[PDB]
Design an enzyme around this catalytic site. Structure first.
Site: not given
Lengths: 187, 186, 189
Positions: A85, A115, A142, A160, A165-166, A183
């Site tokens: 989207n 970086h 989103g 959303s 990070t994992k 869940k």
């Protein structure tokens, strides 16, 4: 012997302003502009343009809303029936592999670029990336952020606003910053 | 006997690639592009273009910065003195009702569109939505997300970065992800 | 006072009338020039630097590297050091001064806000608002989609994790992350 581009794809430190990579980035931006105008104006040539931009798609009919942005384009590989989207950004310095029937809501960002945390190294004109892999039937909600090196398993759903990070296992919903399983999806 | 568009508006599973809905989305994108061009270049005709895009606005003078994005346009209804800053996105598969004197900071996203949690159903070509309702005098902070089916009460303030997953009462500030009341406004 | 205008009040962080004609005209001009700038960088034209140097208040080296589509309120309240880099779709609301040091880099979708509003409806709806300036030190890396709120200072060498929402001053030499942003660890060199 190794080009800066070879280093980049390998996940090694590479010179971002290497002649070849710069040319690839400026070309990606030019083509991206043409693509976004094609999709905004509803021209059928949007698919041909997209197929020149992306590394590959399984069906040549990836459906991507404007304004899409990517670094290279050619490091992005999507399965069948890919949908993204409005306003998605994919920094594909390393491979971004996406499975079949994946669905991005608006403002989803996938980063492979990163970086060094230390200033001297970060300021040295070199950087690196880590590839991202996304399985089949993934729904990314989103504004979600998928960070470098992350893999998302089959049938996973990213809420959303989640900041991922994992790695995300098969068949879960993750949410929050940092994203955590909220869940399990049965079947 | 219901059209796919009829189903969409009622919050039911609808075929997104229905010919009528596809045509509406194509038209909305084409018009949105002209509108964004008009506001970027500062042409007075931006209002007349916007009034052809939105479902309604109370004063025909909604102030919306570039680049605005929406699915249909016609499901968006705003009160008087509506303001949205840069890069706002409204997925208006269902009604999006916004009251008077509401202001969105940059990057505010409003979603009514959603999908089944299980893969077969999600991949079936059908999806659905839930309407969003925003009261009067609401300030939505930068980068906030308003999820489907949410209602936000009068004088509520949404902190930047908030991810709003459930109803927000009148006269509160909410923040965080998921958003929680962090202050009552007196 | 005698000849103080709304623009003066705006810059001083005082309540100001946003629709004052000079300010409206400045925002209209910024958008028009931003559009040209974004086309220039999208098409890879060398004159992108010329246009950018007319938009920003200043840059130390006249060679700030800013990806499309950049958005700003005024442009002229933004001042960047040497080797500035901003990736796709960064937004800077510079109603007050936005001061950025040397070797700073913004990932995609970074938002910096100096603009804010009263918490109570009557005052917020009065046609007046205000700002608080933002200061960012040297060697700052701001991660993708991060938000920097009004009045925030960020110290040298700080790094902001992707998705961070920064509500308070960030000291030098820390990595911060989360909403609200909290210290993750320190960085030394």
């Amino acid at each position: 012997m190794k080009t800066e581009k070879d280093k980049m794809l390998a996940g090694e430190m590479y010179i971002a302003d290497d002649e070849e990579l710069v040319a690839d980035r400026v070309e990606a931006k030019r083509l991206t502009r043409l693509y976004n105008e094609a999709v905004e104006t509803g021209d059928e040539r949007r698919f041909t343009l997209l197929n020149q931009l992306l590394g590959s798609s399984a069906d040549g009919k990836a459906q991507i809303n404007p304004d899409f942005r990517c670094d290279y384009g050619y490091n992005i590989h999507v399965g069948k029936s890919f949908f993204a989207n409005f306003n998605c950004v994919i920094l594909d310095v390393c491979e971004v592999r996406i499975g079949d029937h994946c669905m991005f809501a608006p403002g989803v960002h996938i980063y492979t670029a990163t970086h060094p945390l230390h200033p001297v190294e970060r300021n040295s004109g070199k950087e690196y990336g880590k590839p991202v892999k996304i399985g089949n039937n993934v729904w990314v909600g989103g504004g979600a952020i998928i960070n470098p090196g992350v893999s998302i398993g089959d049938n996973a759903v990213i809420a959303s606003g989640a900041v991922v990070t994992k790695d995300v296992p098969n068949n879960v919903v993750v949410g929050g910053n940092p994203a955590k399983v909220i869940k399990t999806i049965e079947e």
